[PDB]
Scaffold this active site. Structure first.
Site, PDB file in Angstrom:
ATOM      1  N   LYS A  97      74.654  33.451   2.697  1.00 32.66           N
ATOM      2  CA  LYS A  97      75.215  32.307   1.911  1.00 32.66           C
ATOM      3  C   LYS A  97      74.396  31.150   1.465  1.00 32.66           C
ATOM      4  CE  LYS A  97      80.122  30.831   0.976  1.00 32.66           C
ATOM      5  NZ  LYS A  97      80.225  29.657   0.968  1.00 32.66           N
TER       6      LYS A  97
ATOM      7  N   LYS B  18      82.594  27.810   9.669  1.00 32.21           N
ATOM      8  CA  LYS B  18      81.436  27.534  10.657  1.00 32.21           C
ATOM      9  C   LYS B  18      80.691  26.417   9.692  1.00 32.21           C
ATOM     10  CE  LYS B  18      79.679  31.500  10.104  1.00 32.21           C
ATOM     11  NZ  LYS B  18      80.988  32.186   9.457  1.00 32.21           N
TER      12      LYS B  18
ATOM     13  N   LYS C 136      83.473  34.641  12.318  1.00 30.31           N
ATOM     14  CA  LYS C 136      83.551  35.511  11.174  1.00 30.31           C
ATOM     15  C   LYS C 136      83.379  34.678   9.709  1.00 30.31           C
ATOM     16  CE  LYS C 136      87.618  36.854   9.084  1.00 30.31           C
ATOM     17  NZ  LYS C 136      88.263  36.093   8.179  1.00 30.31           N
TER      18      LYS C 136
ATOM     19  N   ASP D 267      79.810  38.495  11.648  1.00 29.56           N
ATOM     20  CA  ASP D 267      80.695  39.579  11.237  1.00 29.56           C
ATOM     21  C   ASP D 267      79.994  40.846  11.841  1.00 29.56           C
ATOM     22  OD1 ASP D 267      82.751  38.359   9.229  1.00 29.56           O
ATOM     23  OD2 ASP D 267      80.745  37.717   8.578  1.00 29.56           O
TER      24      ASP D 267
HETATM   25  N1  LIG Z   1      89.641  22.097   8.901  1.00 28.16           N
HETATM   26  C1  LIG Z   1      89.679  22.320   7.517  1.00 28.16           C
HETATM   27  N2  LIG Z   1      90.657  22.271   6.754  1.00 28.16           N
HETATM   28  C2  LIG Z   1      90.537  22.437   5.288  1.00 28.16           C
HETATM   29  N3  LIG Z   1      89.644  23.183   4.852  1.00 28.16           N
HETATM   30  C3  LIG Z   1      88.880  23.999   5.678  1.00 28.16           C
HETATM   31  C4  LIG Z   1      88.690  23.656   7.061  1.00 28.16           C
HETATM   32  N4  LIG Z   1      87.611  23.978   7.450  1.00 28.16           N
HETATM   33  C5  LIG Z   1      87.051  24.917   6.458  1.00 28.16           C
HETATM   34  N5  LIG Z   1      87.519  24.675   5.394  1.00 28.16           N
HETATM   35  C6  LIG Z   1      87.435  25.321   4.097  1.00 28.16           C
HETATM   36  O1  LIG Z   1      87.392  26.721   4.233  1.00 28.16           O
HETATM   37  C7  LIG Z   1      86.186  27.245   3.425  1.00 28.16           C
HETATM   38  C8  LIG Z   1      85.283  28.156   4.256  1.00 28.16           C
HETATM   39  O2  LIG Z   1      84.648  27.130   5.154  1.00 28.16           O
HETATM   40  P1  LIG Z   1      83.144  27.357   5.541  1.00 28.16           P
HETATM   41  O3  LIG Z   1      82.654  26.418   6.630  1.00 28.16           O
HETATM   42  O4  LIG Z   1      82.466  27.571   4.189  1.00 28.16           O
HETATM   43  O5  LIG Z   1      83.211  28.966   6.279  1.00 28.16           O
HETATM   44  P2  LIG Z   1      81.978  29.850   6.864  1.00 28.16           P
HETATM   45  O6  LIG Z   1      80.871  28.939   6.759  1.00 28.16           O
HETATM   46  O7  LIG Z   1      82.284  30.301   8.076  1.00 28.16           O
HETATM   47  O8  LIG Z   1      82.034  30.868   5.832  1.00 28.16           O
HETATM   48  C9  LIG Z   1      85.675  25.867   2.841  1.00 28.16           C
HETATM   49  O9  LIG Z   1      86.169  25.964   1.443  1.00 28.16           O
HETATM   50  C10 LIG Z   1      86.194  24.837   3.829  1.00 28.16           C
HETATM   51  O10 LIG Z   1      86.260  23.891   2.727  1.00 28.16           O
HETATM   52 MG   LIG Z   2      78.792  29.033   6.074  1.00 27.05          MG
END
Ligand SMILES: Nc1ncnc2c1ncn2[C@@H]1O[C@H](COP(=O)(O)OP(=O)(O)O)[C@@H](O)[C@H]1O
Ligand SMILES: [Mg+2]
Ligand SMILES: Nc1ncnc2c1ncn2[C@@H]1O[C@H](COP(=O)(O)OP(=O)(O)O)[C@@H](O)[C@H]1O
Ligand code: SF4
Ligand code: SF4
Ligand SMILES: [Mg+2]
EC number: 1.18.6.1
Lengths: 273, 273
Positions: free
Chosen positions: B41, B15, B10, B129
């Site tokens: 994104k 990811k 999600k 999603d």
């Molecule tokens: N293990 C973790 N510890 C701390 N922050 C995290 C961790 N994994 C993700 N984040 C933070 O969560 C937010 C979303 O992560 P992201 O990889 O961009 O999500 P997605 O790609 O699934 O939309 C980012 O700001 C990232 O820095």
């Molecule tokens: Mg992403």
């Protein structure tokens, strides 16, 4: 007249919890409301119906043969406070367009006379992680004149709010779909209210309410109830009552001004989240 | 041979952070890797490139005239550890299908010879999603043989994992797309590892790694870096190294067994989240 309102936001941000509690509060003050579920998860009405979920228009049309074989009185169900409830449904994952059921459902409701003059509000609960197909239809086709976006200090939730705002801008030359406000559904982060106020100001709208994180929500939902019904004395019940009052009284409906990713990152850096 | 791997989950679950750190760790051990961003994104490569983001195939094809006017050496960019990076892009919100750019990008990469034998891994970072349009294409069209789903004890994240699993099952009669594992990206909730292990067992897969929540991620990403590059001594760097080792060694690739919503709710009730 009736006000047609749609609640958008990223997945898991609190759309269905906020909508059903908002609507329960409206029913508690004497408003007549319909909720139209426009999310494939299809649990947008369960707290009003005290139910597991609700069988969807897509499912019922398939069992009945065609959508013409469905009657409105068979698909609309009434729950807490007389609130009327319907779920669109959608195709299974990997099959066709996830938003196709929204188009079928809203067209069915319009043709079958669901928008009776005595309704005061219709709320659409819409998946907002992509703005396309049936999920864009309430904006594209002028079904939801007032959009409220549930978000939080989470960057992904703010990004989603900005994306939905871009979709509103895209269709500004026709119809009257407008951004009505941001609803902050808290993650218990400091200055989170300030952050979402700042985001709303940049978009040209307002933060209509800050909804606290409160465990009473989980205790109510385990019992398939809104907090309004489960514990009308709860502090959180008064929070949803305050949100509902401010939606009723809201007069600011704008064509938003979407921001750059630089502006978004600057917001988070500033408020130290 | 090369292993084609896709990371689903999600929105906001982790990811892109998990993929880029996983891939940096693979590059650090001497693997040659390409990341293909399949999320609108379009910031799935920024930590490898030290960049704001990356200009997308959709954007570059529009400036060049057609996608045929693009050369692979113009769109693929190399960053940390020699990791090669590309972003699909997609239409603006409210315009057409949000996943349309994924189809264009993957077809462009295939025709232009991006899948050179010396690559060891390709990772697709895919919005999860909804499972439709171009976001279903890596499953439908047999592009990602090994699916890893990032999730957490959050019910919405577990629901998304179950939805993606249903899409894998839908296309099980053709190609060889399989579920490789769940990756738990922690919310610092107790028994969260136990919960995601339990979910994986019900689906028939495994929890390949439990990634802790660690503020060093934010400190690295403020500086447009993976933790692997930013602080190779960090405990969290070793966590991503352990995840990468277990992906390399993983031999369990299954047609999953999706669960009912009753089973999902029973999981959360049991582990008291
Ligand atoms: N293990 C973790 N510890 C701390 N922050 C995290 C961790 N994994 C993700 N984040 C933070 O969560 C937010 C979303 O992560 P992201 O990889 O961009 O999500 P997605 O790609 O699934 O939309 C980012 O700001 C990232 O820095
Ligand atoms: Mg992403
Ligand atoms: N203000 C709140 N306090 C506590 N829990 C909340 C609150 N708002 C939402 N939740 C919980 O968050 C989860 C997701 O909310 P939901 O409304 O289903 O999200 P969405 O409809 O946007 O996917 C639910 O378990 C809900 O009980
Ligand atoms: S994104 Fe779902 S079908 Fe277009
Ligand atoms: S969901 Fe996006 S276009 Fe079908
Ligand atoms: Mg919902």
């Amino acid at each position: 007249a009736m006000r047609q309102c749609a609640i958008y936001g990223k997945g898991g941000i609190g759309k269905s919890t906020t909508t059903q509690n908002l609507v329960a509060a409206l029913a508690e003050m004497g408003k007549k409301v319909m909720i139209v579920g426009c999310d494939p998860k299809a649990d947008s009405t369960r707290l009003i119906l005290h139910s597991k979920a609700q069988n969807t228009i897509m499912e019922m049309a398939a069992e009945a043969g065609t959508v013409e074989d469905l009657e409105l009185e068979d698909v609309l169900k009434a729950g807490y406070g007389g609130v009327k409830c319907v779920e669109s449904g959608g195709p299974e994952p990997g099959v066709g367009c996830a938003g196709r059921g929204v188009i079928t459902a809203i067209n069915f409701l319009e043709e079958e006379g669901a928008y009776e003059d005595d309704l005061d509000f219709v709320f659409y609960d819409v998946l907002g992680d992509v703005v396309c197909g049936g999920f864009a239809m309430p904006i594209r086709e002028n079904k939801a004149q007032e959009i409220y976006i549930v978000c939080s200090g989470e960057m992904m939730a703010m990004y989603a709010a900005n994306n939905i705002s871009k979709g509103i801008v895209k269709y500004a030359n026709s119809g009257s779909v407008r951004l009505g406000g941001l609803i902050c559904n808290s993650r218990n982060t400091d200055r989170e209210d300030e952050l979402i106020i700042a985001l709303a100001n940049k978009l040209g709208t307002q933060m209509i309410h800050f909804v606290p994180r409160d465990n009473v929500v989980q205790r109510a939902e385990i019992r398939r109830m809104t907090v309004i019904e489960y514990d009308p004395k709860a502090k959180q019940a008064d929070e949803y009552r305050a949100l509902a009052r401010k939606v009723v009284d809201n007069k600011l409906l704008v064509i938003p001004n979407p921001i750059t990713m630089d502006e978004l990152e600057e917001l988070l850096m500033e408020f130290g989240i």
